[PDB]
Symmetry: C3
Subunit: 242 residues, 3 copies
């Protein structure tokens, strides 16, 4: 509940503000977005920062933060560590929206979109399971491994059929740019988890781990959404003719 | 757990019965519904009261009811209030079904339907967060505000592309009728929350707040479903030719 | 937490291994699967055992297992029984994937698929509610009944429009085979629940109830997925031309 750690607190308030600014910027950027495909991607994009603000409020309020006892074998075994589990939970809604926006832009098959969102949800929930598991270190990492497997299913779409769809949709250029951002930035999350306090605890500062995720969110969500939306606004014809 | 409040109890049992009657009435009304679009909307409609009964059983049984301590600043700060949080949770399944039924009727784009359901889920979960937050009054209302934002995303579809789709689908007349019912009745829920015990507590009776939601459910679900289904039965050609 | 019951333990470890073997077998079987419809169903199929392993890890670790006090009237009223509620929870992700795979194979309408998954989720969550309800025996069984109603909605699709779609998709033969497996095997789950400790408790052994579900999973998931995938690999043309 209580929080007397400026490093930790700032990592949360900073994104409530940035997500707030993004929403306002995006609403504005869509001021003259033609109806149909464009406006639709605009809405899906607007919600990325909307879900994000919700996540940070959950954390700030303490609603989605808890103390978890680390199991034998862990660097901090027998100690209680602060787990921002609300991040893992909300990702289950925000990442599917990122994929929805990218999917619409690439005009992929509804079936493919379906499979990818399911895989994404699996990645998120198994990640939450890894954080919440306390009986044995083995199970925490086994969940981490399965979460990685779901992540691979998600990435497989980006490297295969979603790319072929963007080409036929005339959005290959922007898709290729956005694809690099997703693969590189999304890989940062499991690294932070593994290096941070809930993983190997190479970095034992909860404030530091929190800032890492917050910085990733700035680029994987706000900047990502800005780049996607800006392109759509300057290429309404191409996306509308889908 | 215990409940010795007839006002409160009746508000729940009344809808177990009404939802039960609706199911039977709807199954009957679909007795001679031709396969395809019609029968499909019939099924989606049948589940609205099915999910509803589930919600009321959760409440009646006490499974989805809990005591929450109100934070400083609240009219009942320092007191425990009864929170029917199961309502907020089940809305996450029932409202998407209402939107699914309306979406099929209007024959909207799968992508649009997707975005709307996601926004709807966000509205529901942030509403639950508002009710469950106890650390500060500020966060309870911040969640209420974000939930309203998601609600606006949902309504935006009804006022734009979903309406244009119904027109091209030849279902503009029934859609326009159903749209008014959704906008007006759905607006009643955040008013009840704000006026009731979990919000401003202008009305401090949990029994009264419960009845308000129950009455809204009767119209937003049962009556709404009746009107939609009855039209579909008398206009199978128009919906089937979609 | 603690578990000193070989009968119970083996029922869980056995499927971590079998689900692990299935994943490896399926990845292999897809080695030369042409892109498009085939590869897509391959991915959806690969995740069935992926979600399954996740479920068993939750159970093995104790994360998704709890003690529930049975209400008056129950054969074990006033006693605490072990509830593998993680099974019910994960089914909410794995069963929709089974239906997704079957739906893609049958090339059904996106709207129908949507309605079926929602009904499936309802069946799973009401089943979880039945297990978690402790105030009265009446409510436990009322949830069981509603869950059955959702199950009927799911089955209705398999006996109607999904079958007509498979015919037009040229996949009627494999669909008919898979449909029998789903109807017969899926019916086994509510029987186990009713006969086992959480239901009528005709069988009071948690180890025995666990093995029943595990055996059902072997056929409803692993064998089912094998049959589906093998057919797709030998009939790529038919599925691709969808
Ligand atoms: C807006 C937030 C985003 C884009 C978050 C992305 C999160 C992931 C790619 C998380 C992945 C993880 C694994 C692959 C292994 C288990 C631990 C996680 C959940 C951090
Ligand atoms: C069957 C039940 C229905 C149609 C329920 C609808 C509920 C809403 C439109 C709820 C909306 C709310 C907000 C916009 C603000 C936060 C509080 C809520 C969850 C009551
Ligand atoms: C991989 C696991 C599968 C295919 C599980 C299927 C589960 C069901 C068909 C469960 C159904 C139930 C009812 C119809 C009544 C309430 C109890 C349940 C949840 C066991
Ligand atoms: C998919 C990758 C899985 C890697 C599993 C790593 C399991 C080791 O686990 C690690 O062991 C260290 C030494 O005992 C501890 O200090 C760390 O806290 C602990 O997380
Ligand atoms: C989107 C609309 C947000 C409105 C935020 C209202 C915040 C005020 O909150 C209200 O303050 C009153 C006086 O202190 C209390 O009596 C009420 O219980 C409390 O909810
Ligand atoms: C859809 C089918 C619903 C069946 C409802 C059955 C309700 C009876 O419930 C059963 O009663 C027995 C005798 O009292 C007990 O021994 C069992 O434990 C209890 O589950
Ligand atoms: C278009 C389909 C989207 C499906 C999304 C499925 C998963 C929903 C996850 C909801 C998480 C909600 C928790 C919010 C918590 C918070 O921010 O306080
Ligand atoms: C389909 C969306 C449903 C919305 C569910 C919202 C609430 C999620 C609650 C998750 C609780 C799990 C974390 C417990 C953490 C702890 O031990 O404190
Ligand atoms: C067609 C997609 C629909 C997606 C629905 C996603 C959200 C599921 C919410 C499930 C809530 C289940 C809780 C039921 C509680 C009860 O009534 O006892
Ligand atoms: C995707 C669907 C998942 C189904 C999840 C069903 C169970 C939801 C449990 C929500 C618990 C949150 C409320 C806690 C309330 C309290 O403090 O008593
Ligand atoms: C294609 C849409 C699929 C929608 C799926 C909606 C329901 C998600 C259910 C997630 C359950 C996750 C719990 C996993 C628990 C565990 O194995 O440890
Ligand atoms: C949309 C997916 C959300 C993922 C939610 C994952 C966590 C589910 C937690 C369910 C808790 C309900 C069971 C409580 C059992 C008990 O009493 O021990
Ligand atoms: Cl988020
Ligand atoms: Cl924190
Ligand atoms: Cl409801
Ligand atoms: Cl109540
Ligand atoms: Cl499962
Ligand atoms: Cl167990």
């Amino acid at each position: 509940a209580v929080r007397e750690n400026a490093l930790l607190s700032s990592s949360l308030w900073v994104n409530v503000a940035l997500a707030g600014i993004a929403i306002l910027v995006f609403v504005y950027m869509g001021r003259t977005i033609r109806p149909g495909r464009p406006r639709l991607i605009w809405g899906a994009t607007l919600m990325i920062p909307l879900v994000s603000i919700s996540s940070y409020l959950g954390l700030l309020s303490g609603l989605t933060v808890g103390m978890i006892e680390m199991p034998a074998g862990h660097a901090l075994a027998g100690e209680m560590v602060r787990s921002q589990w609300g991040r893992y939970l909300t990702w289950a809604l925000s990442t599917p929206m990122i994929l929805l926006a990218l999917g619409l832009l690439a005009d992929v098959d509804l079936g493919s979109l379906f499979t990818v969102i399911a895989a994404d949800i699996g990645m998120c929930v198994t990640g939450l399971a890894a954080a919440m598991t306390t009986s044995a270190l083995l199970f925490r990492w086994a969940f981490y491994a399965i979460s990685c497997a779901f992540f691979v299913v998600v990435l497989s779409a980006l490297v295969t059929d979603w790319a072929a769809s963007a080409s036929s949709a005339g959005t290959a250029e922007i898709f290729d740019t956005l694809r690099v951002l997703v693969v590189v930035l999304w890989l940062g999350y499991p690294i932070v988890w593994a290096v941070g306090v809930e993983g190997l605890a190479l970095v034992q500062s909860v404030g530091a781990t929190s800032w890492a995720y917050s910085v990733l969110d700035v680029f994987a969500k706000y900047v990502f959404a800005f780049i996607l939306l800006r392109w759509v606004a300057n290429n309404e014809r191409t996306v509308a003719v889908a």
